[PDB]
Structure formats: structure tokens, C-alpha cells
Amino acid sequence: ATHKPINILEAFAAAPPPLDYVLPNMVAGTVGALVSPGGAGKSMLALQLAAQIAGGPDLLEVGELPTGPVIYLPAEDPPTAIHHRLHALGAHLSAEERQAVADGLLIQPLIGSLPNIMAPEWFDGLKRAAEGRRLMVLDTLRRFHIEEENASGPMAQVIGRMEAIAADTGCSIVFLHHAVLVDNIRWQSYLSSMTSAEAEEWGVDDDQRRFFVRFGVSKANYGAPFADRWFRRHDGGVLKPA
Amino acid sequence: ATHKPINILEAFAAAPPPLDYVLPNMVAGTVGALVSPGGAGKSMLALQLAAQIAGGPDLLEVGELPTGPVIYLPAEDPPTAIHHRLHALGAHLSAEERQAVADGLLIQPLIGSLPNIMAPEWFDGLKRAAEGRRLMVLDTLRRFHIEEENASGPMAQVIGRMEAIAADTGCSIVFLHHAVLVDNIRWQSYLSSMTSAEAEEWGVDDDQRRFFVRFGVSKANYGAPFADRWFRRHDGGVLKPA
Amino acid sequence: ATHKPINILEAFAAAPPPLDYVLPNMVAGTVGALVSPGGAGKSMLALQLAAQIAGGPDLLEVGELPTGPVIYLPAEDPPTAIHHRLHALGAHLSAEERQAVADGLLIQPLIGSLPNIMAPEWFDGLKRAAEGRRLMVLDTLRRFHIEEENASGPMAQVIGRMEAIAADTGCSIVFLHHAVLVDNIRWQSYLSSMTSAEAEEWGVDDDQRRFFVRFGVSKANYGAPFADRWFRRHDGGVLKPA
Amino acid sequence: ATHKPINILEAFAAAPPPLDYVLPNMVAGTVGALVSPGGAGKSMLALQLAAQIAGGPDLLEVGELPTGPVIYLPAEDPPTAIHHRLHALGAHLSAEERQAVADGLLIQPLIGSLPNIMAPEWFDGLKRAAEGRRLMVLDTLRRFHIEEENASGPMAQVIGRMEAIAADTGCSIVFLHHAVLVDNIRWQSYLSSMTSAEAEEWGVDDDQRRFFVRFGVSKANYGAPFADRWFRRHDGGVLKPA
Amino acid sequence: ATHKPINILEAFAAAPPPLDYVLPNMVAGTVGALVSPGGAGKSMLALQLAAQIAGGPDLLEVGELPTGPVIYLPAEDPPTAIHHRLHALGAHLSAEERQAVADGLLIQPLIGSLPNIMAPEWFDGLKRAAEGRRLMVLDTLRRFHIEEENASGPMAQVIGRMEAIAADTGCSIVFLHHAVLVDNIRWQSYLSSMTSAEAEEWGVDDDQRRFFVRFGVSKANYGAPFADRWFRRHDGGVLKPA
Amino acid sequence: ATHKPINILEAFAAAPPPLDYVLPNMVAGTVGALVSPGGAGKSMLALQLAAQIAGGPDLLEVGELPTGPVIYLPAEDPPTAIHHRLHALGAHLSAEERQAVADGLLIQPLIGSLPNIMAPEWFDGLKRAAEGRRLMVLDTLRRFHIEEENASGPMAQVIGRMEAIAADTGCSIVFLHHAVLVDNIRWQSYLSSMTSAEAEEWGVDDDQRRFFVRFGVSKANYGAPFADRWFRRHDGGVLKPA
């Protein structure tokens, strides 16, 4: 991506428009990450977040978010598991809310598709898929490159390419990661399954500790502090404040 | 493999077909793993699960499962040992059950065959062998690739290829692993021999502990939790509830 | 860069001109680093030092500094965030000061541009942008190269190149680093948020400690010791003694 | 090596011939390992096992074993050391037993020959030497390859090639290893010098625990458990039950 | 470099010329190291030893050393900083002494020059610059090669080239190192800023111990043990016994 | 190197010639190592062992060893330190002993000669130098290869090459090593400087322990145990029993 030099005098003179946030504390046009131990329901959280930005309700009750076309790229779930998740989520959506989501959200399954962002054709296809879109969700990043996630040089290139896409197209990119990467990224959120100790601080009890997860923004550089939230795993995995 | 975009409107409206499970909690068309030290009888367990999905009896008494053609690829056992394990298993089967196993099961020995899923001819061969099949069992994964099992990059390519074969042909793939794969595999089961501790918890004493192993599903995403199970090792290794 | 042999007798005789400092304890024409953890305010502190050297006011009350053209290269902030920082900073400047800053500061956004100092075009480009300038600020170094930041050989090459540019053009280079490449940079400054401990050695309870940061020069070779300083984070992020 | 698909029905019906064991618990035609710390007698034990299978006496008093041609490849002992070991062992054999050993045992010294199983000439050579033979002993594996023994990929290839030769020719291969080449090799045996503590459990005071070593099978899949054994290191190194 | 076989008989008969030491315990014609952190001021110490060997006074009061042409290669300091260091040191020298230093010392600045001893042109250049010279000081080694200072293989090549230059020209080479090399360098000296401990252990108080540094020879092979020494840091960094 | 198949019958019948030892417990025609920390006297010990084997006295008190032409390759000491070492040692030799050493000992200095056994010309040169010689000493191995000393694959190749030369020529090779390379070497010996412990155990108080070092064979596979010895460092380093 390229940029005009900043016009100092203008910035001084005109009070700027509020910062455009695609997600809590995440500036639109940048790259962010959603981290979690493979088993907390990152995919469901991302689907709901994507459904919201595409037009849907704020079921998760995180701030109200601006709306825009969203593209979700699940590379680790079979199409049928996606259908079931959507059907479940839908039970919480009105006829209007469902049509909104269907209107703004495109889900392109990629399981076994072998996307490689460092390869020409995939870089080009992802860039094009990002054009005119507000958010692009990669689930999970492990499936979009063949590099060692512990090597800072290769990862700088892989994250660089996503930044190049987000900056050029204006489409924000959020990748999911199975818990380096966190040190590169400027916005990072997490999801973690409730623990013993935690099941003994607000209430509840074990055997039931698996119907709850905590979400929160672990790292950001702008905006008011986002308060860690608790979510109850309803049927099919759908998440709600609770 | 390639996929069509999800019809979101449909998934929200129509009741989705129940998930097709190839194994307890494992969605058909995906990749899973059966983990264990190796001397816990992974091969025998795999052969019985393979025989059951092929059309055989539910000797292990795990759930009754949908049937379909199965191909088992043992790369670490000499043919003669495979013969011995079958003859032993055969004693637990009626003639009708034996014929059903033979009708739906193909066992292609590969010891010393040096298959490499990363090489073109083998990838092509493995994919063609997966066509029209419900399950393909790789025993063990270590013998189907020449990459560093500790390097997430090469392993993501290895596993990616299995997901490609599975998604493109609809044939589920389960590989045995002698213990990351834990992170990038959504279904994982395990087997572990009983030690001095467990023996002194259910009955039996040591010097008899070598006749017990517990199964159980270590990681899943969909379905009702699968309760661990204990099996006793009969003559020739055959496993039954007990 | 090249240099002629030192005229030893001439160095013995004439008391040399005072050492030209671009920043406290940093000799003009060299390479330096500003270190700090992801979120502490590196970017804002760097913009204020750059605005000061460009010709603006010494709002940080760090020593008065020689002025000259400055180029700031933010590769991690979306242009809009740069606008907000400038607008907030502008409220602390007179019309004259704003004009002076605009007359000497060039801010060229590079988010998603993927500059690589190891590649020839970027090397030549960075060097031409340095000509006739007093200070070049790289924010942050991680975005100006694709090497492993833990590999001393590649990092030696990356830093050698900044030194080649600085020695050739006389333009000092300061890079920001998200907290080894520290053993070799001769000038090093730091910025750290106020610890719970510190916020109870000077005043104000916690829940306030987040509005303060400590600056100080962590490593230098020339000059009178620079004293650590405390800054309060005013509206927009702007820093002032306080 | 290649194999015909298993005839499942024929395996169910016919009682298979007894499992052919080249060594206790080791199926003929497979690959196995003899493990121990550097100096402890791996070589003498290997030489006695090879002399036995070749047609010689069961001095070790391990089971009675099927005989057949054997080739022993010592790559770490000068020829003269081999002569000394044979001369000493010979003093425990009748003229008949000596002749029998010389009739079925071929010992081809390889010190400084640099065999590389990953290279074509050596692979072809090793394979041709295995043909028509019951057992091939590699002493020690470290000298038959130039790979990193800690790298699973390369070792999978090195081990795969021994499995190819064994499956193709019917000749079993046992390699010695100076203590992963364990999680994959199905048969594993060990030799450990007597503990500074193990003496105070069977008799014999210390400073004498050196003339003793214990044998035993560390890993297997078939056969009745093999009982660990103790051997006394007579003159020349020759091992007798004791 | 090449050498003729040692005449053994001769060396046994004829008494050998005393060993020629370039520095305390360092044999002329070899490679040595001066190690220290960052702010201990090894550049100044190096400049003084270099001035002394060039024909200057023994200001440090280490032993009296044979004189000869010296070339100093500072690759980490701007020329102006060198000018200042020389001017300061000069105030401690008589006219005659200054003249002597200028007569035997050549200081060629190399900051941003990117010397690489592994490259042909630089190897050749350093070699020619070493001819007819008694000492060559590299300040610091990190700036004369691009290899990983942790990798013994590359460092063995880096160090071997210095030894090649030292042996072929008779010019000793001493490189400074900011703290393996330690293991493969026969002569090693060090410098460390006085500790808070050593402070209240000699007669000095804190916030004043910053003016003290201990020198000493950390490793050698020949000669009378060199006693550690304490130096006080006067204006400009100049070091005197004190 | 190549070898004829062992003649089993001949070995059984003829009592073999005693094992030809080049050094205590080291069979002639093999590869061994002398290990020790940077400062201990390895080179003097080696020079003396070399002198003995070449014809000289058993100054060291180690048993009596057969004699033959020896070639010593010091790559880390300047020729002059060698002369001084020889001259010192010669003070303990008769006119006859000196002429003996001079007759069978060849010392070819290689400091800065950059030998690389993995390179064609050097391998060939080292082999030819080993022809018709009884011992070849490499001091130290670090200077004869450019590989990573803790990488088993490359080291196997480096050690393989020495074994190839020793086996093919009959010349034994001993390399010195600054303390992996022990797991591929069958004969290892060491030297350790007496520290504050063994001192207050065998006599001599500190301040005098630097004059003592203990020898001893850390690893072998043949022969009568060699007892750790103590040596007193005389003038010039010459080692004597004491």
C-alpha cells in the first residue's frame, strides 16, 4: 500500500472525525488477532462478531459497531458444521436480522483448500476478496501460510501481507490463532474457558464451568478500556452475555 | 479441495440434516487422530474400528456407527502379523460378520513402502484410494511423511493435504500417532495402558495390568460427550469391553 | 560510507567544536533507539521530539535542541490515527509553532508499504529521504526489515545499513523498538508506564498510574548524564512534564 | 517394498503359521534396535546373538533360535579387535559349533568405510547383502548415515530404508545404538552395566558390578513377555548367564 | 598463511629468542580480545594502548611495551567523537609524545563502512593494512563480519581469517567485544565498571564509582601473571592508574 | 577405507597378536580425543605424548608405548611458542633422546592456515601426511573444520573422514578439543586443572594448585583400566609425574 505525506496544517486545523473502529479498540483498515486455546469456541465468537458487523444484532452485547460487508474464511470446519452453527445462531435472529446478515455476510469455506498468502495467486485472490469489504476473518491463520509461527522474519512477511491488504483496501483483517504473532499485531483479543478458580469467584460450579468463557481485549493502542466480558455457551455454541 | 459459498439464508431457514459422524464425535469428511505410546495396542483398536465401520459387529461396544467402505493402511506391521490379528479377531465373529468385514474392508500393507503424502504420486495414490470410501486409516502418520513432526509449518502442509483428500472425496481420515498435531486437529482420541495406580482402583492387580487399556475421546467439537471406556486385551490382542 | 584518516596532530591542537547532539546524549549522524513495551506512548513521544527538532516548542522540557528538517516514518499507525495525534498536539502550540513544525516535519505514512532496508530500492529510497535532513524516525524498526530480530548477523546488517545512511548523509536515525540489538546501538532511550510501586513513591493512587510515564536515557557515550523524567499523558496522548 | 492387499477371508479361515521370530519377540523381516550406553558390551552381545542365529551355541541361554545366514557389519571396531573377540568366544565352542558359525556368519568390517544408507550405492549394496540372509546387524547405526539423529524427518527416512530392505528381502535388521529411534522401532532391546545399587540386591560387592550387565527386551508387540536376564562378563568379554 | 616445519633439533639446542609480547601476556603475531559491557569505555582504553604501542607514554602504567606502527579501526564512533577523545588524551601528553603517537598511529574510521572480513575485498584490504604493522585494533568485532556470534562454525572462520592475517604479516590483532569467541581465543582481557560492592570496599562511594573501571587479563598462555588494575576516568574518558 | 571379510576360522584357531595400542587403551588405526577447558595444558601434554611415541622418554610416567613416526599439527599456537615449548621439554632429554624425537617427530605449524578436512585438497593432504605414520595429532579439531560442533550429522562426516584416514593408513588420529563429539569417538581422554577442592585433599594449598592437572582416560572399550594420574607443571609447562 502507498500513502500521501501527511498534511500537517490540515490535521492541526480540522478536528478529525472520530477514529473508525471496526471492533472494540481496533481501528478499521488494520490487522488484528483473536487468540484462544483450540476449544473455547473462537469460531462461534468470530461468526457472531462477523454477523454483527454485517448488519446483525449485538447479541454478544459488546459495543454497537458500524456496519459493512464482511467475508468469513473458515479453513478448519467442514461446510456442514458451518450450517449447523448458522442455524443455531439464527434461532436468536428475527426475520429482519437474518436477512440483514445474509445481505452483508459472505462465508467462503476453505477446508482442504490450502490457501497460502505468501503465494501469488492466493495473495491476489485475498486482496480482491477484501475490496469493498469492512472485515475479513481468517479462521485460523495456521491454514493460510506454511511458515514457522515462531520465526519473526517469516511472520513479519505474512503479517506484512495482511497489513498491505487491509491498508490498501480499507478492509480490516482479523485472524484467529490457536494459543511471535502477538508481538507484531497491534490489536489482540482473547477467549478462554472458565477455570476452577474462576468458577469460584462470581458463582457457578464445576461440571458447569464449560458453559462459560471470558472475552476481552488483551492488547490495543486506542480507545477507552474494553471491559472483560463473560459469555454463556447456549445450544450449538451460540454466545450471549449471561 | 474447493467449496461453494454458504447459502446463509437457507442455513437460517431450513432444519439442517443431522451431522454425519464417522466415529464418536468425529464429523465425516474430516481428519482425526488416535494417539498413544504404541505398545498399548493402537493398531488392534484401529483394525476393530475399521472392521466395524466396514460392516462388522460393535465388539468394542462404542456406539453403533454408519457403515461404508474402509481402507486400512498399516505401514509398520509385517503382513504376517496383520494375518495373526485378523485370525484372532475372526474368532469373535459369525460367518455373516466376517463376510461383511471382507465386503467393506480393504487392508493394503505398506511396511517398507515409504509413502510420502508430500510427494505427488503418493498424494495422487492416496486420494484415489479415498474415493468412494467412508474411512481411511493411516497407521501411523510417521510413516506417511518425512517432515519434522515438531515443525508446525511442514506439519500444517502434511495435515492440510489430508484435509484436502478428506474434503474433496468425503472420506474421513484417521491417523495413529505415537506420543503440534494436538492444535491443528479437531478430533482426537487416545489409548493408554493401565498402570499400577489404576489397577488398584477398579480391581485387578499388577502382572495383570498389561491386559487393560482405556479408550476415550480427548478432543472433539460436536456431539454428546463420549465417556472413557476400559477394554481388556484377549488372545491375539483382540479388545472387548470387560 | 567512507572516511578519511584522522589527522591526529590537528585533533591534538585545536579544541574541537562542541559535539553536535541531535537528542540528549545522541551525537548527530549516528543511530539510536527508543525502546518500550507495545503500549506506553513511543509513537507520541517520538512525534513530539520530531516536532521539536523540526522547529517546534520544547513541550517535554527535555533540553532545548538544535533544529533541522525531520522525516517521520510511521509504519504501524493508520493515517487517521496520525491525524488525531497531530490535532491533539496542535492544541498546545501557537500558530507560529504550528507553522514551524509544518515547515520542518515531513510525515510519510508507510503502514502496509512493507519497507525492507535489506532490499536495494528501499535502501536507496531511505537514504535519499535522509539527505539534507537532521533526523529520520523509524516507527517501529520491526516494519523496516524481514529478518529474525534474534539473529545478530542479520541484525548487524540491518543496523549497519542505518549507520551507513546516517554517516553518509549526516542525518541521525532513531528507531522505535517494541521491547540482542541493544548491545550494539550506542544511544538508547526508554519509555515505561508507571508501576504500582512507583505510583506510590511520588503520589497519586493506582487507577492513575496509567496517566504517567518515565523517559530517561538508558545508554549513551557522550555528554552530561541526562536525568530521568516524568510525563503526564494529557488529552490525545500528548506528553508534558507535570 | 510392495505388498499385495490382504486376503481377509483367507486370514479368517486358515490358522496362520506360527509367527517366525528371529530374536525373542522380534518378527523376522522387521527392524529392531539394541540400545545401551557407549561401553557396556553391545558389540560382544551382538556378536553372540549373530553367532547363535548363524548356527552356533546358545551360550547366552536366551531362547533356542531358528538358524539362517547372518551378516554382521561392525563399523566402529578395527578388524584386530574383532579377531580378539572371536578368538575368546571360540574358546566356548566345540569344533562343530565353531565350524557352524563360520558356515553361516559373514563379518564385513566397515571402519572408515563411511556407509551411507541415504546414498544409492550403499542402499543398493546393503540390500544385496541382506538377500538370502536371516539377519543383518548394523554396529552402530550412527555410522550408516550422516543425518542429525535428533531430527525425526531424516531419521524416519533412514529407518524407512531399513524397513524397505527387511520387507523386501525377508532379512531382519538389528541396529545398535549408543543411548526418536524408539517411538517408531517396534522391537527394542537394551544392555545396561550393573548399578552401584543393583549389586546390593543380588549379591556381589561393588568394584565388581562391572563384570555384570542385564539384558531384557525394552519394547515388543508379539510373543510371551521375555524375562530380563543377567550375564557375567567372562574373559575377552564373552557373556554367560551366571 | 603457511609455515615451514619446526626444526626440532635446533629448538632443542639453540636458546630461543625471548617471546615478543605486543601486550601483557600476548604474543606478537596472534589474535586477542578485549571484552566488556558497553559503558566501561573500552574504545578509550583501546585508543590508549594503541597510542602507547605507537610510541606514546605508558599513562595506564601497565608494563612498558615494544613500539611499532599501529592501525586503529573504529567502526562504531563518529569521527567527531574520535577527535574529542584524541584532544582529551592529548592534554596528558608532551609535545614529543604527541608527535610520537602521530608518527606511529593510523586511525581509519569505518562507521557505516560495513567491513566484512568474510568478503574478499575486505579480507584483502585488512591484510594489506596489517602489513608492516605491529598492532591492528578492531573496534568492535561485531562490525567486521555478518555471521551469528553464537555459531561456532562461522566464528571459527571469522577468527581464522584474523589469525591468517596475524600469522602472515606478523601484525597482532586485538578485537573489542561487547559482552564462542572466549573458547577459541588464546589471549583475553577485560574491563568492568566498578560494582556497588567494590565501591564500599575500596574507599569510594556510590554515584562516584561510575568513574572507576578494573582492567586485568582474563586469559593467556605465556608470561608473568598480569595483576588486575584500577583506572579512574578523567575528563573526556581518559584513563589513568589513580 | 576397505576391508576383507573376517576369516572366522583363522581367528578361532590362531591366538591373536596382542592388541596394538598407540596410547593407553587406544587401538592403533583409530580416532581418539583429548578433551579439556581452554587453560589446562592440552598442547604440552600432546606434544609430550607425541615426543614419547616418536622415540623419546616416558617423562609422563604413562606406561611404555610402542614407537613410530609422529606428525603434530598445531593450528592454534604461533611457531615461537612451539620453539619455547620444545626447548623447555628438551631440558629433560639426553642428547640421544633429543635426536630420537627429532628423527620420528614432524611438527607442521598451521596457525592461520585454515585447514578444512571436508575440503578436497586438505583431506587429500592430511591423508598423505598420515601415510607411514603411527600418530597424527590435530590441535585442536576446532581449526580443521567449519561445521557446528554440536550438530551430529556434520560432525559424523568430520569424524568419519578421520576414521577413513586412520583405517586406510594405519596412522592413529588424536584430536584436541576445548570443553557430542564423545558419542562418535570410542577413545576419549581428558586433562583438568586442579581446583579449590582436590587441592585441600591431596596436599598443596591454593595459590599453588595452578601447578597441577589430572590426566586419565575418560572413555575406552579395550585394555586394562588406566588410573587417573597427577602431573606437576614445571617451567615452560613441561609435564612430569609428581
Tab-separated table of N, CA and C in Angstrom, chain D residues 18 84 191:
chain	number	residue	atom	x	y	z
D	18	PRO	N	3.015	-70.365	12.728
D	18	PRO	CA	3.457	-69.603	13.900
D	18	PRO	C	4.268	-68.377	13.454
D	84	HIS	N	40.144	-60.678	18.139
D	84	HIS	CA	40.280	-60.957	19.557
D	84	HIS	C	38.983	-61.416	20.145
D	191	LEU	N	20.995	-53.103	27.012
D	191	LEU	CA	22.080	-53.700	27.778
D	191	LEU	C	22.592	-52.579	28.672
